[PDB]
Design a protein around this nucleic acid. Structure first.
Lengths: 62, 48, 206, 68, 140, 142, 141, 84, 72, 100, 8
RNA sequence: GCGAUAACGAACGAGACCUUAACCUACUAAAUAGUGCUGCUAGCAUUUGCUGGUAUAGUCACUUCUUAGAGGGACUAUCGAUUUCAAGUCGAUGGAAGUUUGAGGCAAUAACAGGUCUGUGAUGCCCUUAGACGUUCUGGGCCGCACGCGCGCUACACUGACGGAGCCAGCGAGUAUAAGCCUUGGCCGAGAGGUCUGGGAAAUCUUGUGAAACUCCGUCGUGCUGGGGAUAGAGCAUUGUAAUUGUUGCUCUUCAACGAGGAAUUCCUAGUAAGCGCAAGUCAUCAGCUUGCGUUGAUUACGUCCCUGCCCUUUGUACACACCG
């Protein structure tokens, strides 16, 4: 049940130590359900990173 | 045992029975003069 | 197809490479593909290579490392633990000999196998720590493909390195067991147990 | 960062306010121009002025620059 | 005299003095064949400018190289560039530039080091450490 | 090539009150004997035509009796004085190589002599400290 | 084709020239070869007692062919390695001069070497003749 | 050998001449203020771009101090200090 | 100290090596040690014989490691 | 005719270059065949002295330099001609040696 | 930092 | 720096600058650098070639690789993007170099009870100055160990040990009537070392410092094993007037803990980290240390204020010898 989403914009850095980022993804299939999510790794625009689970939004990390 | 060379062969080394001290550090107002002879307002007026 | 006669005679086997560039002139990169949609960009398999020793400037810019050949990113990953720093040739001696071991086992392409050992062991979500100044706190997020490429390899080599610690088994034969097993998702091998626990705790932290 | 300093920035605009018609959008021409226009004791300094004088020159084409 | 060009490819300190004349397929290292260059695991590296364009370009040219300096691995890379530049230099002087540009594209697209020496060099050690940037471990 | 045998091996080997592992290569095996380094057993085997590709347990009685003859009579088999242990002894002035039981004996025998002559070295020997001038202010913590 | 010493791989040729040399037997062996160390920094004599002097001599003859009037002082630096100093870091240690000086003395009386002027030890007319011969009968296999 | 004494054309422009001359005026019983500005004006009189006199030590007091008298333009970092 | 590898070859093991190795895909120095319980010294000498007689096909030639397979 | 070698050494290149040029100037208009100048590798005199006269504080090092420039000029001329060239092309910084 | 004393 | 602006225009510091490193087939020349030719010479298949020796007259040619003086070259260059469309930033192509091009040197206003009177013929003052705290001389001591701490190394094994085969760097130093320099090359020595010549006051000679890691081929084969080299015993040399409380090495011999290390904490973003050796220093000998060089050569960032530290602004004060108040 793993779903893939391509990123289309990076918002900025987040997390207490700045090691995570807020990035705007767009799903590979069904280009809808725009969800802001966080990435532990470095992010360029247009990353095809997949999702273990989708039903969760993201916020700033303490 | 008058000469120190001959007596050396007998003295025991009693070192590994007694515990050396657990704490052994033995090497406060740096800003306060202890001279007690303060230079006057006039001396600076004459010195400078 | 003709044997090109040079005064300084060219060996027969290398004359085959006039058609295609191959790793050790034994492994072909045409039949090597990445079985993961997001990992194609960060796994460079398009340009054929002769030996996993290229010596490029891939750390100068932010994402220059995405173009590095996949084989070199493991032989670089081999030489760690101080004493092995700079022993890239030995690490290539580990990779090349292993690929000889890798082909006779499971009968698959050795450089296709290593790509499969990289896609399978990449954890997709990691529970990052969000401690509020000292306390123990964790938060689950995603993992980028670039990190998901690189984290698998470092796990792969570590499992190779400890398999040969105080062990009669050598590093190359440990690696061949490591690579083929972690390519198929073997829970027995390293880079699967260390991966699975990473995604395990991430579920209870989201 | 590649921020130019003020000593190169003020020396660049004093050239435009004096020799604008002789200035061009090409760095090479400005590189050679500033040699016979201003006595610049350092070769590295001379290239920095012309490289930002050209940028000032290459800006006036898109519209009026502020302060010059 | 005869058709000859002089070139050299450079590495860390290894500077590879390659001579290309008009003759047979003689490609030698210090007067010794390229079939026995060490380390043998990287014997493929010095072959790269040979098989990328094909060995037939070396029929009419003979190559003798002499390299002093650098390190053993640095020797492998320098000779590679020198003969690759020797091929291009010889084609430039005695053959049309249609070949020099054509063959260079095969060389350019495979590795930039096939033509241009890299600038990566060790930086001086500064006092206060065993290395260029490393410093003595500090004691509190 | 690999070979086969039965009964010619000897699990427990015995040379001069000293036990040698029979399954380990002989030129290494003799080092269990005091007075044998890896250096010493290299040569006493070579001139005895003990091929280095064998073990301790393969050598029959004959070979052992010859090597212990060379072992205890090294000067009689052109083993040099610089290759011996106890060269130019005090008591007789003949080159010697003290062995399994007799190495520590002349080791002790040298101790009380320096203790007899109240020399500084034997003075430091009685205490159990370093005697070659090395430093105990921070390291002699074992 | 003109076979030369520089045309044949060194590792297998040195085995072949020594293989010829041992069967030849005209090179005299010092009696201490089974007693002595190769260098001051070694810890074990060479494990091939029967061949190491011939393997050493065959290489030294081949090595000298490549270079010009190399003396015996140069030879020690060639074969020495890193001594295993116990706790101190490694230092380069010279080779044993008695073995090397004998070898150049030994190969000179068998016709492979001679004393060159202004120091060193040149390779002889026939030393090149035999070495390039043994090379010619090396690479057919 | 031959030794020749050449009269220094600009006395104020020479630090060695002015530093030595200040030493004598310092020993001559003059106050430091009168002495220091006698060479400060002398240097500015000769046309010097800048001048800095730092008279440091102890003076009629137990604690020691430092005192500086800068005049004119003064550059501090780089080659021109070695040059000017 | 749990190795207990045997380096002296008896009659019980020589024939079994002719019975064990032919039923292998790939062998190495440890493989002969890991499952046959023979030593590495006995492993390398056995490989240099198992190959010379034609039973073993050499995959790679090296000193620090050896890659072999069955010739059947 | 005489084979005469002239060696020029100094610390500052500019005065050494004037001496190097002026000798060639005296070797040019006078029809005298020459070989040089040969720019000898520079010699830097390096010592890493410690900044602290005492031994307190952080470890900083002074590494002072002496760049020495040497050239050799072979002159094929009588000794009377070459000797007068040096005095024409003298400089206090540059020492001049003449040898046949 | 000591006071010198003689015997002879 | 843009910008906002009761400010405007300036100066010091930073940046500029300089040393070093990269590119230059474009200059100037190179018998203390090399190459191609040219002699004369060699071995092999004889193919006219492949390798070399020699050549301070072959009275060869050249600077391309090596040296260094004169210069040139990059100034974020041009393009796609975001930005107050500004300062800038981010991605490309060119380029030798697009992280301030790389790394360093000099480096502001005042100041610290930071360190040194143990470098001074730099010092004021107290002490002492002929039985001297001055000197000189012999012998000792800084090394001395019941203990805790740190700067390092040796390693804890097979990505390895030995044993052969191969065999590349760079920075540097080196003398006379001495008080003995670098020392080759030859001759003796298992080794260390010993003898006889000769070069070099120096790109020549020492020294291509043929350094080690490394590559290969063999034994070893998980054992505290042949990983490791403590502690100790015997002889031979070296240096010094003098080596005992081993100067040091060498030969043999003894064959230790250590099987990867807790709470903690350090250095570091590219030829950098980390493995690996080499030289200069103190030095008559003594380098596990610093100073510099060269070989191999990475992993991950290219962000933040979470920790710590500092800086600025706001704020508070009964402090100004300034919270050590």
């Amino acid at each position: 049940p793993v779903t893939l989403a391509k990123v289309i914009k990076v918002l900025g850095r987040t997390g207490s130590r700045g090691g995570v980022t807020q990035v705007r993804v767009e799903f590979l299939e069904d280009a809808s359900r725009t969800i802001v999510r966080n990435v532990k790794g470095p992010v360029r625009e247009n990353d095809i990173l997949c999702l273990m689970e989708s039903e969760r939004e993201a916020r700033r990390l303490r | 045992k008058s000469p120190t060379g001959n007596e050396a062969a007998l003295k025991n080394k009693n070192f590994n029975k007694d515990v050396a001290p657990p704490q052994s550090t033995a090497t406060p107002f740096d800003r306060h003069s202890r001279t007690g002879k303060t230079d006057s307002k006039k001396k600076l007026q004459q010195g400078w | 197809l003709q044997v090109v006669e040079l005064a300084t005679t060219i060996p027969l086997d290398v004359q085959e490479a006039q058609r295609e560039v191959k790793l050790f002139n034994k492994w072909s990169f045409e039949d090597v593909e990445v079985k993961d949609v997001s990992l194609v960009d960060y796994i460079q398999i398009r340009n054929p290579v002769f030996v996993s020793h290229t010596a490029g400037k891939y750390a100068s810019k932010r994402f220059r490392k995405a173009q590095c050949p996949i084989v070199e990113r493991l032989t670089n990953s081999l030489m760690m633990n101080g004493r092995n720093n700079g022993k890239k040739l030995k690490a290539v001696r580990i990779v090349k000999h292993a690929l000889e071991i890798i082909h006779v086992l499971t009968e698959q392409n050795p450089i296709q196998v290593v790509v499969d050992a990289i896609v399978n062991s990449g954890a997709r979500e990691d529970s990052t720590r969000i401690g509020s100044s000292g306390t123990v706190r964790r938060q689950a997020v995603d993992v980028s493909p670039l990190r998901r490429v690189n984290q698998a390899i470092a796990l792969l080599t570590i499992g190779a390195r400890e398999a040969s610690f105080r062990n009669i088994k050598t590093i190359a034969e440990c690696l061949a067991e490591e690579l083929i097993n972690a390519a198929k998702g073997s829970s027995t091998s390293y880079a699967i147990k260390k991966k699975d626990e990473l995604e395990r705790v991430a579920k209870s932290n989201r | 960062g590649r921020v130019r300093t003020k000593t190169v920035k003020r020396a660049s605009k004093v050239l435009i306010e004096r020799f604008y018609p002789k200035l061009t959008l090409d760095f090479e021409t400005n590189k050679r121009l500033t040699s016979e226009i201003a006595v610049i004791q350092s070769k590295r300094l001379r290239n920095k002025i012309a490289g930002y004088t050209t940028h000032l020159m290459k800006r006036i084409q898109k519209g009026p620059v502020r302060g010059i | 005299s005869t058709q000859s060009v002089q070139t050299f490819g450079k590495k860390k300190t290894a500077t590879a003095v390659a001579h290309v004349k008009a003759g047979k397929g003689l490609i030698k290292i210090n007067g010794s064949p390229i079939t026995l260059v060490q380390p043998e695991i990287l014997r493929f590296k010095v072959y790269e400018p040979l098989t990328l364009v094909g060995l037939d370009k070396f029929q009419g040219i003979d190559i003798r190289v002499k390299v002093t300096g650098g390190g053993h691995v640095s020797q492998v890379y320098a000779i590679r560039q020198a003969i690759a530049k020797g091929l291009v230099a010889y084609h430039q002087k005695y053959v049309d530039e249609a070949s020099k540009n054509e063959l260079k594209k095969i060389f350019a697209s495979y590795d930039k080091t096939l033509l241009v020496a890299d600038s990566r060099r060790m930086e001086p050690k500064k006092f206060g450490g065993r290395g260029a940037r490393a410093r003595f471990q500090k004691s509190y | 090539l690999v070979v086969q045998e039965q009964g010619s091996f000897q699990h427990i080997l015995r040379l001069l009150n000293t036990n040698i592992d029979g399954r380990i290569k002989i030129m290494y095996a003799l080092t269990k004997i005091r007075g044998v380094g890896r250096r010493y057993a290299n040569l006493v085997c070579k001139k005895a035509d003990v091929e280095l590709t064998k073990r301790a347990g393969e050598l029959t009685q004959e070979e052992l009796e010859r090597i212990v003859t060379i072992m205890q009579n090294p000067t009689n088999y052109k083993i040099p004085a610089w290759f011996l242990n106890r060269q130019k002894d005090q008591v007789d002035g003949k080159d010697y190589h003290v062995l399994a039981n007799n190495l520590e004996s002349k080791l002790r025998d040298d101790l009380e002599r320096l203790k007899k002559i109240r020399s500084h070295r034997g003075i430091r020997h009685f205490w159990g400290l370093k005697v070659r001038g090395q430093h105990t202010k921070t390291t002699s913590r074992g | 084709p003109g076979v030369s010493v520089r045309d044949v791989p060194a590792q297998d040729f040195i085995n072949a020239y020594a293989q010829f040399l041992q069967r030849q037997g005209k090179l005299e062996v010092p009696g201490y070869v089974d007693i002595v160390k190769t260098s001051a920094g070694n810890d074990l004599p060479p494990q091939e007692a029967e061949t190491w002097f011939y393997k050493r001599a065959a290489s030294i003859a081949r090595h000298i062919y490549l270079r010009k009037q190399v003396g015996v002082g140069a030879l020690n630096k060639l074969y020495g390695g890193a001594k295993n100093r116990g706790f101190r870091p490694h230092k380069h240690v010279d080779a044993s001069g008695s073995i090397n000086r004998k070898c150049v003395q030994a190969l000179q009386k068998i016709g492979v070497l001679e004393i060159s002027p202004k120091g060193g030890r040149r390779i002889s007319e026939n030393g090149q003749r035999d070495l390039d011969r043994i090379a010619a009968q090396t690479l057919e296999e | 050998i031959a030794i020749y004494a050449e009269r220094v054309e600009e006395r104020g422009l020479s630090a060695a001449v002015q530093a030595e001359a200040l030493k004598a005026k310092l020993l001559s019983g003059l106050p430091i203020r009168r002495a220091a500005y006698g060479v400060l004006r002398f240097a500015m009189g000769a046309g010097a771009k800048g001048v800095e006199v730092v008279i440091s030590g102890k003076l009629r007091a137990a604690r020691a101090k430092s005192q500086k008298y800068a005049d004119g333009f003064m550059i501090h970092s780089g080659q021109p200090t070695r040059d000017f | 100290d749990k190795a207990q590898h045997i380096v002296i070859l008896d009659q019980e093991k020589y024939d079994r090596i002719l019975k064990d190795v032919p039923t292998y895909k790939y062998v190495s120095v440890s493989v002969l040690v890991d499952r046959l319980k023979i030593g590495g010294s006995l492993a390398r000498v056995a490989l240099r014989q198992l190959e010379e007689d034609g039973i073993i096909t050499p995959v790679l030639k090296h000193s620090k490691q050896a890659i072999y397979t069955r010739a059947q | 005719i005489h084979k005469i070698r002239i060696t020029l050494t100094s610390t500052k290149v500019k005065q050494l270059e004037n001496v190097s040029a002026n000798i060639i100037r005296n070797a040019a208009q006078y029809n005298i065949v020459k070989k040089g100048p040969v720019r000898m590798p520079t010699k830097v005199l390096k010592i890493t002295t410690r900044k602290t006269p005492n031994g307190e504080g952080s470890k900083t090092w002074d590494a002072y330099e002496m760049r020495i420039h040497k050239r050799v000029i072979d002159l094929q001329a009588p000794a009377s001609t070459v000797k007068r060239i040096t005095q024409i092309t003298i400089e206090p910084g540059v020492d001049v040696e003449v040898t046949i | 930092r000591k006071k010198k004393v003689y015997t002879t």
